[PDB]
């Protein structure tokens with residue numbers, strides 16, 4: 215329940231398995247696509263182009279299917 | 286010091302919570318896990334919620350410390 | 351940054367002063383400060399809900415408070 | 418090194434101010450006290466305003482600016 | 485570029501030159517004036533009275549005319 | 554860390570790629586990235602302007618960047 219011991223494995227699994235996600239922004243806008251990569255502050259989401267979403271503007275990330283969770 | 290043992294308890298006892306977001310949206314479910322920056326909330330699929338986007342975590346029944 | 355914040359919150363906590371917490375989205379929560387740390391405040395009423403400080407705009411006691 | 422002396426000037430001279438919050442709310446009163454994260458705004462009661470919720474501090478009259 | 489290596493010079497230039505700016509806040513509100521001074525966390529915006537603006541509440545700083553670093 | 558944000562922004566800059574920058578309040582800005590630091594981006598064209606990153610939600614390149 216500490217560090218990034220949750221967020222990183224999670225995003226990585228989404229990326230590795232190319233799971234389609236919805237990313238809801240803090241203003242309620244919804245983005246959809248696949249996680250191409252990410253770092254400590256941003257997530258790169260694919261579709262028409264690969265856009266760079268700032269984590270500070272994201273509220274939730276909702277995978278289109280259940281997925282392995284971090285250990 | 287308060288946040289962790291608190292979230293810990295909600296997770297452990299599997300108490301259904303309402304998570305209200307900074308824009309007013311209400312999310313509902315059970316807390317599977319959480320780390321320093323995010324909380325994993327469980328329903329149909331488990332979704333990842335950034336804490337910076339949360340205003341309040343409201344348990345649907347009272348708990349202790 | 352907790353040289354005014356902490357004693358202020360602790361005073362509200364020890365004396366159980368009824369307070370309103372207003373959120374950045376305008377939701378007004380009412381109750382009392384059960385407890386707090388560096389990042390959240392635990393506000394009591396029906397249940398005790400955990401409030402993220404980053405989401406708070408103001409804390410408004412129902413009555414004036416010493417310090 | 419600028420924020421501090423400014424706020425302190427508003428405090429010492431008891432200048433009436435409007436504080437606009439990031440959501441557009443306008444609070445009025447005077448700066449009673451402050452630390453790194455919050456401002457104690459006095460009027461009906463003295464409430465605690467988190468600095469992160471604030472967009473601007475606007476004095477009702479021109480005031481000495483920090484040199 | 486690292487750190488404040490763009491923000492400080494850019495602001496410090498708008499300051500020195502007394503260029504009229506529009507400052508948009510995260511809520512869509514537009515302030516206008518001249519940058520009197522600034523530090524790590526706030527900008528003092530000068531007009532009828534100077535006002536102290538928290539950088540955290542600002543989205544964009546738009547000069548009234550082109551400026552050169 | 555910045556192992557992605559920085560090379561991404563620098564590639565946009567060096568290659569003069571047109572971007573649309575969407576702010577947290579839903580307003581969309583367009584132009585080329587002239588410069589950037591850890592905290593702000595300088596956007597240029599029909600109007601030159603300094604953008605705080607904390608107020609940005611997405612940077613959408615008008616064509617794909619290749620690391």
Ligand SMILES: Nc1ncnc2c1ncn2[C@@H]1O[C@H](COP(=O)(O)OP(=O)(O)NP(=O)(O)O)[C@@H](O)[C@H]1O
Pocket residue numbers: 372376378407408410442444464
């Ligand atoms: N100190 C505050 N912090 C954040 N929001 C406030 C505050 N005071 C008032 N508001 C909001 O702005 C609205 C207008 O307030 P107002 O009509 O002047 O009455 P008030 O005594 O200042 N607060 P209230 O007792 O809740 O009505 C209120 O209804 C609140 O929603």
Ligand SMILES: Nc1ncnc2c1ncn2[C@@H]1O[C@H](COP(=O)(O)OP(=O)(O)NP(=O)(O)O)[C@@H](O)[C@H]1O
Pocket residue numbers: 337374403404405420453454468469470525538540
């Ligand atoms: N030493 C300081 N001097 C002046 N302002 C500060 C200082 N430290 C933090 N702040 C402000 O207070 C906020 C930082 O507190 P923080 O614990 O990060 O909550 P927050 O994330 O800013 N709340 P929010 O922006 O609504 O998500 C920022 O807005 C800062 O601008």
Ligand SMILES: Nc1ncnc2c1ncn2[C@@H]1O[C@H](COP(=O)(O)OP(=O)(O)NP(=O)(O)O)[C@@H](O)[C@H]1O
Pocket residue numbers: 437441442443472473475513515535
């Ligand atoms: N210095 C400021 N900082 C943040 N918001 C402001 C500021 N000045 C005005 N506003 C906002 O702008 C709107 C109203 O301002 P405006 O129409 O320009 O005149 P006014 O503020 O109503 N005049 P007054 O309130 O009597 O000083 C409100 O939404 C305010 O929140």
Ligand SMILES: Nc1ncnc2c1ncn2[C@@H]1O[C@H](COP(=O)(O)OP(=O)(O)O)[C@@H](O)[C@H]1O
Pocket residue numbers: 238242243244273274276310312332
């Ligand atoms: N998991 C979520 N995270 C953030 N916002 C959400 C989430 N689910 C729904 N919303 C928002 O809640 C609001 C209500 O719409 P809603 O009826 O829930 O749509 P839907 O049923 O397709 O999810 C919408 O604005 C939507 O963006």
Ligand SMILES: Nc1ncnc2c1ncn2[C@@H]1O[C@H](COP(=O)(O)OP(=O)(O)O)[C@@H](O)[C@H]1O
Pocket residue numbers: 508511512513514543544546580582602
């Ligand atoms: N360069 C900019 N930076 C940030 N916000 C902007 C910018 N230009 C326009 N806006 C915002 O767009 C919003 C739309 O308001 P509006 O009444 O249509 O005037 P305008 O079309 O000039 O923007 C405004 O609230 C303003 O905040």
Ligand SMILES: Nc1ncnc2c1ncn2[C@@H]1O[C@H](COP(=O)(O)OP(=O)(O)O)[C@@H](O)[C@H]1O
Pocket residue numbers: 239243245265575578579580581610611613
């Ligand atoms: N890639 C994005 N990142 C952040 N916000 C976006 C993005 N794309 C669209 N939006 C938001 O969605 C809203 C409108 O969506 P959009 O369909 O693109 O507009 P339009 O209907 O004019 O084509 C805008 O207010 C904008 O803020």
Ligand SMILES: Nc1ncnc2[nH]cnc12
Pocket residue numbers: 305340341343377379399
């Ligand atoms: N954010 C919120 N919105 C509505 N009711 C609430 N009760 C506790 N927190 C709440």
